[PDB]
Design an enzyme around this catalytic site. Structure first.
Site, PDB file in Angstrom:
ATOM      1  N   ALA B  20       0.811  -1.211   0.000  1.00 30.29           N
ATOM      2  CA  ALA B  20       0.000   0.000   0.000  1.00 30.29           C
ATOM      3  C   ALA B  20       0.852   1.272   0.000  1.00 30.29           C
ATOM      4  O   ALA B  20       0.694   2.129  -0.873  1.00 30.29           O
ATOM      5  CB  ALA B  20      -0.955  -0.004   1.187  1.00 30.29           C
ATOM      6  N   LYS B  21       1.751   1.387   0.971  1.00 33.53           N
ATOM      7  CA  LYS B  21       2.553   2.604   1.123  1.00 33.53           C
ATOM      8  C   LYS B  21       3.673   2.732   0.090  1.00 33.53           C
ATOM      9  O   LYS B  21       4.020   3.843  -0.306  1.00 33.53           O
ATOM     10  CB  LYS B  21       3.129   2.711   2.542  1.00 33.53           C
ATOM     11  N   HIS B 248       5.648 -13.419 -13.906  1.00 30.26           N
ATOM     12  CA  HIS B 248       6.263 -12.299 -14.621  1.00 30.26           C
ATOM     13  C   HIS B 248       6.874 -12.720 -15.956  1.00 30.26           C
ATOM     14  O   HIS B 248       6.586 -12.126 -16.995  1.00 30.26           O
ATOM     15  CB  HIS B 248       7.347 -11.634 -13.768  1.00 30.26           C
ATOM     16  N   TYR B 382      17.885  -2.438 -28.204  1.00 31.86           N
ATOM     17  CA  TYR B 382      18.967  -2.352 -29.180  1.00 31.86           C
ATOM     18  C   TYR B 382      19.161  -3.640 -29.971  1.00 31.86           C
ATOM     19  O   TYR B 382      18.844  -4.737 -29.498  1.00 31.86           O
ATOM     20  CB  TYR B 382      20.285  -1.898 -28.529  1.00 31.86           C
TER      21      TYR B 382
HETATM   22  N1  LIG Z   1       5.053  -6.052  -1.097  1.00 34.97           N
HETATM   23  C1  LIG Z   1       5.140  -6.191  -2.422  1.00 34.97           C
HETATM   24  O1  LIG Z   1       5.818  -5.427  -3.092  1.00 34.97           O
HETATM   25  C2  LIG Z   1       4.408  -7.301  -3.123  1.00 34.97           C
HETATM   26  C3  LIG Z   1       3.161  -7.726  -2.671  1.00 34.97           C
HETATM   27  N2  LIG Z   1       2.486  -8.713  -3.283  1.00 34.97           N
HETATM   28  C4  LIG Z   1       1.174  -9.150  -2.778  1.00 34.97           C
HETATM   29  O2  LIG Z   1       0.352  -8.061  -2.335  1.00 34.97           O
HETATM   30  C5  LIG Z   1      -0.375  -8.429  -1.158  1.00 34.97           C
HETATM   31  C6  LIG Z   1      -0.025  -7.488  -0.011  1.00 34.97           C
HETATM   32  O3  LIG Z   1       1.373  -7.577   0.261  1.00 34.97           O
HETATM   33  P1  LIG Z   1       2.039  -6.857   1.535  1.00 34.97           P
HETATM   34  O4  LIG Z   1       1.566  -5.424   1.552  1.00 34.97           O
HETATM   35  O5  LIG Z   1       3.522  -7.152   1.526  1.00 34.97           O
HETATM   36  O6  LIG Z   1       1.370  -7.690   2.742  1.00 34.97           O
HETATM   37  P2  LIG Z   1       1.618  -7.344   4.298  1.00 34.97           P
HETATM   38  O7  LIG Z   1       2.242  -8.539   4.980  1.00 34.97           O
HETATM   39  O8  LIG Z   1       2.276  -5.981   4.422  1.00 34.97           O
HETATM   40  O9  LIG Z   1       0.087  -7.279   4.780  1.00 34.97           O
HETATM   41  C7  LIG Z   1      -0.768  -6.255   4.284  1.00 34.97           C
HETATM   42  C8  LIG Z   1      -1.737  -5.797   5.367  1.00 34.97           C
HETATM   43  O10 LIG Z   1      -2.683  -6.847   5.591  1.00 34.97           O
HETATM   44  C9  LIG Z   1      -2.902  -7.042   6.991  1.00 34.97           C
HETATM   45  N3  LIG Z   1      -2.448  -8.382   7.446  1.00 34.97           N
HETATM   46  C10 LIG Z   1      -1.176  -8.842   7.505  1.00 34.97           C
HETATM   47  N4  LIG Z   1      -1.144 -10.113   7.980  1.00 34.97           N
HETATM   48  C11 LIG Z   1      -2.414 -10.479   8.232  1.00 34.97           C
HETATM   49  C12 LIG Z   1      -3.100 -11.684   8.746  1.00 34.97           C
HETATM   50  N5  LIG Z   1      -2.385 -12.781   9.093  1.00 34.97           N
HETATM   51  N6  LIG Z   1      -4.455 -11.652   8.854  1.00 34.97           N
HETATM   52  C13 LIG Z   1      -5.178 -10.565   8.512  1.00 34.97           C
HETATM   53  N7  LIG Z   1      -4.612  -9.437   8.037  1.00 34.97           N
HETATM   54  C14 LIG Z   1      -3.268  -9.336   7.880  1.00 34.97           C
HETATM   55  C15 LIG Z   1      -2.123  -5.958   7.714  1.00 34.97           C
HETATM   56  O11 LIG Z   1      -3.000  -4.884   8.038  1.00 34.97           O
HETATM   57  P3  LIG Z   1      -3.869  -4.830   9.393  1.00 34.97           P
HETATM   58  O12 LIG Z   1      -3.167  -5.734  10.377  1.00 34.97           O
HETATM   59  O13 LIG Z   1      -3.790  -3.362   9.745  1.00 34.97           O
HETATM   60  O14 LIG Z   1      -5.240  -5.321   8.987  1.00 34.97           O
HETATM   61  C16 LIG Z   1      -1.090  -5.490   6.716  1.00 34.97           C
HETATM   62  O15 LIG Z   1      -0.798  -4.101   6.901  1.00 34.97           O
HETATM   63  C17 LIG Z   1       0.009  -9.863  -0.836  1.00 34.97           C
HETATM   64  O16 LIG Z   1      -0.999 -10.762  -1.306  1.00 34.97           O
HETATM   65  C18 LIG Z   1       1.313 -10.083  -1.576  1.00 34.97           C
HETATM   66  O17 LIG Z   1       1.506 -11.463  -1.924  1.00 34.97           O
HETATM   67  C19 LIG Z   1       2.982  -9.332  -4.361  1.00 34.97           C
HETATM   68  C20 LIG Z   1       4.216  -8.993  -4.899  1.00 34.97           C
HETATM   69  C21 LIG Z   1       5.049  -7.938  -4.332  1.00 34.97           C
HETATM   70  O1  LIG Z   2      11.359  -6.084 -10.690  1.00 37.96           O
HETATM   71  P1  LIG Z   2      10.508  -5.360  -9.673  1.00 37.96           P
HETATM   72  O2  LIG Z   2       9.392  -4.570 -10.298  1.00 37.96           O
HETATM   73  O3  LIG Z   2      11.286  -4.623  -8.608  1.00 37.96           O
HETATM   74  O4  LIG Z   2       9.765  -6.528  -8.853  1.00 37.96           O
HETATM   75  C1  LIG Z   2      10.529  -7.562  -8.232  1.00 37.96           C
HETATM   76  C2  LIG Z   2       9.673  -8.339  -7.236  1.00 37.96           C
HETATM   77  O5  LIG Z   2       8.452  -8.762  -7.851  1.00 37.96           O
HETATM   78  C3  LIG Z   2       7.558  -9.416  -6.946  1.00 37.96           C
HETATM   79  O6  LIG Z   2       6.354  -9.761  -7.644  1.00 37.96           O
HETATM   80  C4  LIG Z   2       8.223 -10.670  -6.383  1.00 37.96           C
HETATM   81  O7  LIG Z   2       7.354 -11.322  -5.452  1.00 37.96           O
HETATM   82  C5  LIG Z   2       9.529 -10.291  -5.705  1.00 37.96           C
HETATM   83  O8  LIG Z   2      10.215 -11.442  -5.202  1.00 37.96           O
HETATM   84  C6  LIG Z   2      10.406  -9.568  -6.715  1.00 37.96           C
HETATM   85  O9  LIG Z   2      11.641  -9.203  -6.098  1.00 37.96           O
END
Ligand SMILES: NC(=O)C1=CN([C@@H]2O[C@H](COP(=O)(O)OP(=O)(O)OC[C@H]3O[C@@H](n4cnc5c(N)ncnc54)[C@H](OP(=O)(O)O)[C@@H]3O)[C@@H](O)[C@H]2O)C=CC1
Ligand SMILES: O=P(O)(O)OC[C@H]1O[C@@H](O)[C@H](O)[C@@H](O)[C@@H]1O
Ligand SMILES: NC(=O)C1=CN([C@@H]2O[C@H](COP(=O)(O)OP(=O)(O)OC[C@H]3O[C@@H](n4cnc5c(N)ncnc54)[C@H](OP(=O)(O)O)[C@@H]3O)[C@@H](O)[C@H]2O)C=CC1
Lengths: 484, 484, 484, 484
Positions: B20-21, B248, B382
């Site tokens: 999100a952030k 990907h 290229y």
């Molecule tokens: N981070 C990335 O760049 C990437 C993310 N993704 C996918 O995007 C999705 C979100 O990823 P990410 O933001 O890293 O996830 P997080 O682990 O940061 O979790 C996201 C939010 O969900 C809530 N949460 C976390 N764990 C639990 C739990 N066990 N039960 C209920 N709520 C929970 C929390 O909010 P709160 O506790 O406030 O409800 C948390 O802020 C995932 O499905 C991930 O696979 C895929 C590829 C890359």
């Molecule tokens: O190449 P980008 O856009 O930085 O993304 C890389 C990431 O993409 C995510 O989807 C994978 O779960 C990560 O493991 C990987 O590192």
């Protein structure tokens, strides 16, 4: 190589001339500086003019045209020490005997292991004296084959049509072997022209595309800002077709259209060039637009007919667009646009291979791909294609994959005559016009040329500095080149 | 255009999270600044965390990840004014009723002509809560079709094999139409990946070359310097194949191999992607090399097995090279090399289309042409080819026709998520993974994945920061990619 | 199959008609004899005519049109035992209720395991009653889906232009699913037309050649010796374009030009046929030659205008040559010649794929290769090419590689309607005109047809038995078909 | 045409031999009967044998081998009237002086306008006497160029490897010009071999297909039922590779693989044949299977080693399958299977161009297309392809487009030696082995041959009348020819 182990004498006939000082001697200077000539080479100027002070002529006149003096560390005096001058006529056998003896004196002074010496005769002379000089040299200034080779560098014009050029070749036949004759077309010494063969046949990408299935149109373009003033009316009897199209652009044409050669040996390459030129359909009045430049709008440049050396009712074209057809299976249906003009908006020599439209799925949101080879100025090769517009907008635009030599490579590209003289000394005939190659070129344009001389082809005016006559652009468009 | 005439509410579920952030809110900020979102849009964060100070969280945490702040005069406060936060669970219907009401409040406050509002739900949540959230939204937070659309943006993982992914899709079937679901694969938002389709089908030059007659080998490469430390062992159950190859690089594979689509409409394009993926021969243990990184030579980076969250006898691959075959007439006999690794010498994502050798007349004095598309870093396209060595030397060398975006274009390319969110708002499904597209991808790798879990495929060590295991390079070489 | 385990009722509406006795019942007889229908099938004739003696009508009239009676050992009486007749109107709901009950009685008498019955309605009726019959059947004679399927075989004409045909389809929309409708184009049941798809896509030899790189011109030809006399002037409002070009030859066109389908399933094939037809440029007056036959030279055949049922100033064409263009990358620049005429020198249906000239090295000592598919008479496929003249003379001549079915294969090829009825019973829609397929065809010819009705296109006379108007041959020649 | 205006003398040296009576004289008879020789031609037999009765030898022995006697009303006595015989040695200059004088007598008796006479020397002699005869003829039986030409027809073997063949050519160099030498490879006189060049380059259909994009495998096959018994062990020192592969099948190979020639002139064609042969990778032991026939199962034919003239531990192969590679861009990756054997199940000479599979949409319901050229027996060309099974069944089967010469054409095809002798008289060298062409062929096989003589290549047994050794078929299969 073995060039070092035997004496080398380079005789510049017509050494007092325009080509000699502007191109020949400067090219030789560059070859000396790059270690491409032997240190103990002998360069002998020969002409009718008497030289009161040879050292001054060399230091003031000749050295004035040398370039790249400061950047690299090469001494000018050392090179000038290798140059001698000698006076003589172009017809009298007594003078060719004197020439031979002067060469002999230089050859005997050679200190290396082997005896005799190799002789390169550069004929920087007008066409009027050509045959007489060839006869004199053949009769009384040849090295015997056992003691070294003899090579003749000869310059255009080579006649003015098929017939005149054939007579000229027949006069040379008994005097020299075709091996010994090196006919200059100086465009074959230009970097991007030399690269055509490598581009086409070293790369699968271009090999697969190089036929009528993928190619829609090929354009070969020559432009100059300069006019034909101050020539003394020398251009009037020649015209733009004889001056650059029949030779420079036809050479380029042959390289772009030939089949893959059997090897990279000189005769295998030249065979293919002759083969394809004999398949070109001769140009005709209906498939051309001619032009003759008039005074510029700003007033600086006077018209072609204001040059005091041209007759008042001259048909002489300073501009020409031709549409040619190559009748074979690789090229059937592919129009070849050859254009060449003086007194135009820019200096340019480029080749444009315009490919067919990919009709689906982009339709009018794409346009024809184009390979562009620019030999001058700022030599470059680039491929024009369609791509997504960078960023969030999901649209298309035309862009390029670019290779600009001055940005990519940190090297100064040599004048055409450096490459060619060097290749003549090595004995490589690849980039020199063969007797049958020359004949094939004249046959393409002679019917048109004779028509033009009889006054049967209209010649259109265009202001110097303009892009040429308007109907030249319309002719290009209907011929199949989509300008965009 | 009609997006402006009706209320728009974008709900980010899991707004307190990493994605999100770092990606979601920053992308939305950029869309706001480029006039791509309505000025009166409502962005509503939703998560279980309680926010003591929403304004501070927005100003300090969220705004900290915004980029290009100085480049444009786009005000940050104006965008943050559009963001609200709200607390609630991911399972209780009472909370989805509260969510609906909060959206209703925002929709009623819309001042434009039309009634209701369009709702985009972004599920930035873990897979454990996915189905429960989809059920709650479907049951109690849907707009009626007459008053606006509902769209779901959902993130990977989508199961861990063919079976688990199919179950997941079947749970979604009764909750949402396929039209409403927008499955993210964020590589489809990257500039050079978006350009693949245009490069291939807008250009005759590449259209004519894009088959087994001209192409010798295709390589798709993913490299990262970063490891998998500090993740909490989340990677161990996933592995490199599930993490990046299955999604990907398979997406890229499908774009590079699909037939020309019937039109540029979303479903015509997605149909072709599914069609070709169903013709890919499933990967197998014999045609792959797996790797798991160990501690770096310099000592800075610890090994994969030193991460306290991974079991001691883990087979989890951090590196993998696969050889795939596409069994159809365009691609028969053309090996596809897919490689992906973490803890390597560089960060890289590139595509290499290596063409066949032009055997004659240059032989070993030329080498294979190669089209290179580099998506990151420093995005560029290229074409590697052979040319004459510039200057007097008459030799060959390999060079490029180059298009490097940062030199050619004066624009900052957006993050992947800007393009994708924008396209979801426009209702264009082109760059989103369809249900059957997803199934086709899992079928390619599932047999291999199950073998790896049973411990039947060897996993080789390689030091972090190295180029990977040595036998990966040997595998690539015998597979048909000539590295040079 | 499962066709045997459930009752089968085939209802021939308009059983007293021309098509019924000449094509429908004879085809059904052949299907019975080859074990392609169940032994206990029920064939129910339905029409307004009252039958005084059903047994006599069957034995004398119907059986009179059965063929291959003697060669194979199939009893005629057994087949006729399966045929019933019934009287009723084409509009009254009371009669469709009676029809339903008669079918029910036959279905209950079925002795096999499963209940209900499958119903095939063959509409061998004029276009005037079509919609009313469809409404009656839909309303009061449908089997419920659980107890069996319902399929409708319907005959041309399907309107007379884009608009009339679209209205007709819209009236059918609420009555039947597109799955249930089987629109006949009986040319799709002919052996050599059925083989087009296999010829093109099962063979590398033709796959590689099937585009504008190798193909110079495609000609599709329909000729008949018969005229249009004794129709009652039914042809006058239709014309040759509506009668055979818009349907039969356009179907052939679509099979010859479509892309390779995604599979051999019915909808994958029909999708490709629709796709290519939507890329055909609509015919126009400038690119056609029309003809209307006059009295024969020998005097036997009277002219078109001597038929007492045609108005005296009729523009109705009995002959037409069209030049069409298919605007896509496979077919750009390849002229498609469609020709069709009645009252000509022979009966013929053939397809000619004329390839480009191989210009070198034979020049005028070779000629264009040509693939010829002849559907009738004496069905055959042959490839015309150049070969050395057999023997000591070292010359060239044109010859063929031949496949003539009556010489190679010892089998009697079925009438078109045997294949099609069989495929309708199997539920395979491949060789039936889809609703959108029909629309695409009308759009090609409608602009031309409307012009012809307004009297804006010249119609040329030609004597019956001649080859057609002379300027048709000149039109063909300039269009790009080299006749030799 | 000018052959008639000057005397013609055809001298058959070794006229008492096997080739003379079986091939040479019969071919000359056919040429006489077809008006291809002048009516006043002189045919002079020359050998060491003394002829007691020349008229009887001509009538009984020679005329016994003439064919088509009844078919035309061509009188045998008239032809025999043109034949004389003469006794002499092959080394003594006195006898070549006698030969010259006998020719002079015949030339003086010529009644036409021009003086002198053209002389064709046919050397139907063993290799042991070859050079001595060439020296005698050169020294004392040449016509002076002003009075007519001299041509030498010479027979194989031409050495037994690269070295021996080169020595032989060097001995001929000072005796005759290459223009005067006509080296026979009699397979170049066979109808279907002569047609290869026309088939390939006169037809767009085959021109477009003739490369590695469409061709999967090329097989050239030679089979004979006859063994090598009764030869006197002449075959043992030669073997199957030297006997038929190095010459007959390599000639066919060159015609099938050469590039399109620059014209149809003899040297343009021969240049291309040499060019491609120099690009063939030399055969090696690993890519071949050798065989030597043993006694037949039925007992009639004894084994190769039972022939009393062969040593007991002979490696001499009577059977060989080779896999060759042609290293250029047309043929890269296309395996060429050359096979040749004696004592096999049938007599056959055929060429099979097996194309690649069309993978979709028919998969295993189609098979590879194949162009088959059968030179003997029953000469024919046919194209194997997939088609719909005729009739109601909607299935596939393999069929052919056929051209069988004995069915299509009502002409008797001449023996190879009729065509060749005729072409030698016309002065056309197209179908005769050039000195450099011969050298290129020996270089392909010499390394293998020397290995075989050293006993380094295994030779497998096979029963006479069988299909050869089993592992020959397995070698063919893995080489890429799919037999079906
Ligand atoms: N981070 C990335 O760049 C990437 C993310 N993704 C996918 O995007 C999705 C979100 O990823 P990410 O933001 O890293 O996830 P997080 O682990 O940061 O979790 C996201 C939010 O969900 C809530 N949460 C976390 N764990 C639990 C739990 N066990 N039960 C209920 N709520 C929970 C929390 O909010 P709160 O506790 O406030 O409800 C948390 O802020 C995932 O499905 C991930 O696979 C895929 C590829 C890359
Ligand atoms: O190449 P980008 O856009 O930085 O993304 C890389 C990431 O993409 C995510 O989807 C994978 O779960 C990560 O493991 C990987 O590192
Ligand atoms: N037979 C065939 O079909 C084929 C023949 N050839 C080639 O054609 C040529 C002739 O073949 P063929 O007719 O079978 O040869 P033969 O063995 O029949 O010899 C031909 C003639 O040459 C003379 N001769 C034979 N042996 C000797 C010798 N040791 N010294 C001098 N003269 C000799 C004999 O005539 P006399 O004693 O009267 O002088 C004999 O009649 C050979 O080079 C052979 O390789 C090639 C392929 C097939």
């Amino acid at each position: 190589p073995e060039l070092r182990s035997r004496a080398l004498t380079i005789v510049v006939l017509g050494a007092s001339g325009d080509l000699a000082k502007k191109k020949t001697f400067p090219a030789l200077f560059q070859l000396y500086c790059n270690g491409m000539l032997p240190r103990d080479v002998n360069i002998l100027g020969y002409a009718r003019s008497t030289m009161e002070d040879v050292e001054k002529w060399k230091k003031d006149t000749l050295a004035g045209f040398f370039t790249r003096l400061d950047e690299r560390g090469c001494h000018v005096g050392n090179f000038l020490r290798r140059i001698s001058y000698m006076t003589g006529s172009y017809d009298r056998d007594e003078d060719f005997a004197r020439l031979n003896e002067r060469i002999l004196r230089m050859e005997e002074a050679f200190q290396g292991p082997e005896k005799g010496g190799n002789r390169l005769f550069y004929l920087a002379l007008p066409p009027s004296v050509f045959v007489g000089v060839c006869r004199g040299l053949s009769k009384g200034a040849m090295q015997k084959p056992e003691l070294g080779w003899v090579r003749l560098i000869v310059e255009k014009p080579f006649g003015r049509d098929t017939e005149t050029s054939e007579q000229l070749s027949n006069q040379l036949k008994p005097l020299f072997n075709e091996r010994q004759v090196f006919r200059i077309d100086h465009y074959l010494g230009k970097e991007m022209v030399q690269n055509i063969i490598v581009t086409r046949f070293a790369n699968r990408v271009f090999s697969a595309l190089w036929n009528s299935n993928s190619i829609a149109c090929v354009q070969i373009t020559f432009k100059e800002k300069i006019g034909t003033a101050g020539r003394g009316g020398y251009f009037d009897s020649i015209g733009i077709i004889r001056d650059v199209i029949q030779n420079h652009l036809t050479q380029i044409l042959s390289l772009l259209t030939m089949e893959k050669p059997r090897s990279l040996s000189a005769e295998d390459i030249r065979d293919e060039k002759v083969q394809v030129l004999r398949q070109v359909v001769p140009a005709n009045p209906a498939e051309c637009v001619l032009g003759q430049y008039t005074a510029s709008a700003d007033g600086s440049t006077p018209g072609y007919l204001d040059d005091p050396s041209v007759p008042k009712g001259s048909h002489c074209p300073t501009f020409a667009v031709l549409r040619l057809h190559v009748n074979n299976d690789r090229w059937h249906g592919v129009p070849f646009i050859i254009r060449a003009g003086k007194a135009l908006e820019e200096r340019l020599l480029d080749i444009r291979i315009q490919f067919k439209d990919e009709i689906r799925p982009f339709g009018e949101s794409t346009q024809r791909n184009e390979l562009v080879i620019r030999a001058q100025p700022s030599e470059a090769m680039y491929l024009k294609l369609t791509a997504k517009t960078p960023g969030l907008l999901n649209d298309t635009h035309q862009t390029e994959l670019d290779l600009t030599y001055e940005r990519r490579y940190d090297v100064t590209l040599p004048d055409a005559y450096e490459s060619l003289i060097h290749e003549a000394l090595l004995g490589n005939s690849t980039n020199f016009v063969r007797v049958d190659e020359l004949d094939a070129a004249w046959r393409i344009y002679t019917p048109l040329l004779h028509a033009i001389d009889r006054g049967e082809v209209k010649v259109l005016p265009y202001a110097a500095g303009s892009c040429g006559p308007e109907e030249a652009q319309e002719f290009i468009r209907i011929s199949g080149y989509k300008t965009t």
